[PDB]
């Protein structure tokens, strides 16, 4: 299958990404607390539902939440201000809370059931969010011996996610809070930070073939806008 590209609503961020977030890929956004990682996740959960000529993939969403940070109210706001029915947009987001990292890992196997089910409907799953990818792993695997063990568990978790992305033509979008020499297996890593005026600034990390520079946008009632 040819890959699809989900618009973020930010012109500069779309250009930085080569058109948008890719299916058959894992995109990791990382940055400090308050940088806007979960804002970007809420935004994408609405944008992906738009038809293709408007930058979406006419798709359904699955969302694994580890910090109780999913806000239906924010989905409602973004949908309303983009011409969409908020209740319909919410209906196409399938939501689960992960209790710990082991439950988080099992929920990837669980997600495959709904992915198969919707595969030939008019709104197949096109976006899978894990927010936060790493918070449970950071809490649970800690102290002497933990670096090797945590990296092995995360490697397996990310392989399971790569398989769903690649097998079912899905964009996987994950978040990671950072206050820096560990390995990462995401397809693309985006460093996000909050700068002056509350503007948000995004930079690609280790991505030579993608456009040099930084995207800059604001958090708004429509999600994000330049």
């Amino acid at each position: 299958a040819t890959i699809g590209r989900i618009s973020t609503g930010s012109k500069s961020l779309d250009k930085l990404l080569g058109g948008g977030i890719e299916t058959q890929a894992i995109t990791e956004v990382f940055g400090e607390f308050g940088s806007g990682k979960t804002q970007l996740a809420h935004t994408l959960a609405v944008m992906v539902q738009l038809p293709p000529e408007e930058g979406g993939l006419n798709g359904s969403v699955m969302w694994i939440d580890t910090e109780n940070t999913f806000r239906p109210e924010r989905i409602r706001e973004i949908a309303q201000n983009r011409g969409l029915d908020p209740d319909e947009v919410l209906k196409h987001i399938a939501y689960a809370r992960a209790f710990n990292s082991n439950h988080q890992m099992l929920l990837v196997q669980q997600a495959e059931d709904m992915i198969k089910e919707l595969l030939n409907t008019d709104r197949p799953v096109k976006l899978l969010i894990v927010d936060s990818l790493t918070s449970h792993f950071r809490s649970e695997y800690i102290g002497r011996g933990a670096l090797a063990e945590r990296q092995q568990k995360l490697a397996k978790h990310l392989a399971d996610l790569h398989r769903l992305a690649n097998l079912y033509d899905i964009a996987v979008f994950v978040t990671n809070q950072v206050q820096h020499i560990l390995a990462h297996s995401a397809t693309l890593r985006v460093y996000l930070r909050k700068g002056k005026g509350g503007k948000r600034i995004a930079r690609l990390i280790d991505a030579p073939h993608l456009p040099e520079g930084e995207a800059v946008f604001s958090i708004t009632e429509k999600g994000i806008e330049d």
Partner: peptide, 4 residues
């Protein structure tokens, strides 16, 4: 998973 449940609808949002």
């Amino acid at each position: 998973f449940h609808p949002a």
